[PDB]
Design an enzyme around this catalytic site. Structure first.
Site, mmCIF file in Angstrom:
data_model
loop_
_atom_site.group_PDB
_atom_site.id
_atom_site.type_symbol
_atom_site.label_atom_id
_atom_site.label_comp_id
_atom_site.label_asym_id
_atom_site.label_seq_id
_atom_site.Cartn_x
_atom_site.Cartn_y
_atom_site.Cartn_z
ATOM 1 C CE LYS A 63 60.575 50.889 59.701
ATOM 2 N NZ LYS A 63 60.404 50.279 61.237
ATOM 3 C CE1 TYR A 169 31.975 36.960 37.127
ATOM 4 C CE2 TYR A 169 30.322 36.123 38.943
ATOM 5 C CZ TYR A 169 30.497 36.367 37.553
ATOM 6 O OH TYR A 169 29.480 36.461 36.679
ATOM 7 N NE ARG A 171 36.607 40.033 47.792
ATOM 8 C CZ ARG A 171 37.546 39.618 47.460
ATOM 9 N NH1 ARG A 171 37.455 38.113 47.315
ATOM 10 N NH2 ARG A 171 38.748 40.184 46.867
ATOM 11 C CB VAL A 179 37.150 31.586 37.363
ATOM 12 C CG1 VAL A 179 35.702 31.254 37.451
ATOM 13 C CG2 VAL A 179 37.215 32.712 36.444
ATOM 14 C CG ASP A 180 38.255 31.605 43.370
ATOM 15 O OD1 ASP A 180 39.301 30.838 43.141
ATOM 16 O OD2 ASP A 180 38.392 32.884 43.676
ATOM 17 C CG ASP A 241 41.902 28.130 41.570
ATOM 18 O OD1 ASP A 241 42.596 27.548 40.728
ATOM 19 O OD2 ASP A 241 42.336 29.260 42.348
ATOM 20 C CG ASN A 264 37.873 33.899 54.361
ATOM 21 O OD1 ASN A 264 36.711 34.221 54.365
ATOM 22 N ND2 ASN A 264 38.337 33.001 53.121
HETATM 23 NA NA NA Z 1 40.011 33.980 43.118
#
Ligand code: NA
Ligand code: NA
EC number: 2.7.7.7
Length: 326
Positions: A63, A169, A171, A179-180, A241, A264
């Site tokens: 491809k 954020y 990272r 927002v975690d 979150d 992860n």
């Molecule tokens: Na996030």
DNA sequence: GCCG
DNA sequence: CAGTAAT
DNA sequence: CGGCAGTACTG
């Protein structure tokens, strides 16, 4: 810098088409190949060179060459006409491929169709209400203001509580999709019963505008996924979150919630090759799995005071959050 | 889709 | 349970 | 062949 933009741009289209049609594993294969191509030090200019790169096999190589020689990709021209509509619907929070395909089959073609005619879950109705906002990213500075709003509210009823913003954020990204916020208490016990106090406080100041996922009945709530908006003009609704974890789980929770998701998965994949298991809760050793890679025996939780410990226990060099995009 |  | 979501 | 990560709500 991407030295193969003309390639990946076209592969990305095909990749997203596979994803919304539910072909999860084919889409994963494309995503890996595409990332490999974004990362290669030069333009890829031959079939044999394309195959040489990890994540690219003969099928993807063919491809790549077709695009390299003809400027088009035949597979693109034959993508189901439904795909743009499926993408539209799947970008409603709480609707995935199965719901998007159902809605399409039922004749719906636009968000206006969905609003007026579709059956919507409580979550999906909130998603639809905030459709544009949920596709926007916020300046990282606004993420700071949101984390501080949660931290001040948490620390107001327990000064000992540690709050940290994770995900993109942490990272180091310039902009954030949500927002975690990870919350813990360095004393093993105090972190219990706090969602109820935190949420009621954030509601009383009108900060939270909608709840998507919030099991507040029995005090075993682990996560809150919802919607907030800072005060004043020019403010948008932002996804918030929050997770609250026991102190001993802090490093694994920090690591999980910082991501990226691909980071992860790759780290957890590695852990499994070593008969270990990594989750948001803990790094475990001596896990027992059957022939299909499925856990049949629990293993042993390993002490992990810090992120560096998790890396160390896995035989991996430490990587700073900013280096965890992939 | 890739790859062990 | 299937579907969807978190990273 | 067949795995491709490990979790937590919803209804
Ligand atoms: Na996030
Ligand atoms: Na969605």
């Amino acid at each position: 810098t991407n030295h193969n933009l003309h390639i990946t741009e076209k592969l990305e289209v095909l990749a997203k088409a596979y994803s919304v049609q539910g072909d999860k594993w084919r889409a994963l294969g494309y995503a890996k190949a595409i990332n490999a191509l974004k990362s290669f030090h030069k333009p890829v200019t031959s079939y044999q060179e394309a195959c040489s790169i990890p994540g690219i096999g003969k099928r993807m190589a063919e491809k790549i060459i077709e695009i390299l020689e003809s400027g088009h990709l035949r597979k693109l021209d034959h993508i189901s006409e439904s795909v743009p509509v499926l993408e539209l619907f799947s970008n409603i929070w709480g609707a995935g491929t199965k719901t998007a395909q159902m809605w399409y089959q039922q004749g719906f073609r636009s968000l206006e169709d969905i609003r007026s005619q579709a059956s919507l879950t409580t979550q999906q109705a909130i998603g639809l209400k905030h459709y544009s906002d949920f596709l926007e990213r916020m300046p990282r500075e606004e993420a700071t203001e949101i984390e501080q709003t949660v931290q001040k509210a948490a620390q107001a009823f327990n000064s000992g509580l540690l709050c940290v913003a994770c995900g993109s954020y942490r990272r180091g990204k310039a902009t954030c999709g949500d927002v975690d916020v990870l919350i813990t208490h360095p004393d093993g016990r105090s972190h219990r019963g706090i969602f109820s106090r935190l949420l009621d406080s954030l509601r009383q100041e009108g900060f939270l505008t909608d709840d998507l996922v919030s099991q507040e009945e029995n005090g075993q709530q682990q996560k809150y996924l919802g919607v907030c908006r800072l005060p004043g003009p020019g403010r948008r609704h932002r996804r918030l979150d929050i997770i609250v974890v026991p102190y001993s789980e802090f490093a694994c929770a920090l690591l999980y919630f910082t991501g990226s998701a691909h980071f992860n998965r790759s780290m957890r994949a590695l852990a499994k090759t070593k008969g270990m298991s990594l989750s948001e809760h803990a790094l475990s050793t001596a896990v027992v799995r059957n022939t299909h890679g499925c856990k049949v025996g629990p293993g042993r939780v390993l002490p992990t005071p810090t992120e560096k410990d998790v890396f160390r226990l896995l035989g991996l060099p430490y990587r700073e959050p900013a280096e965890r995009d992939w």
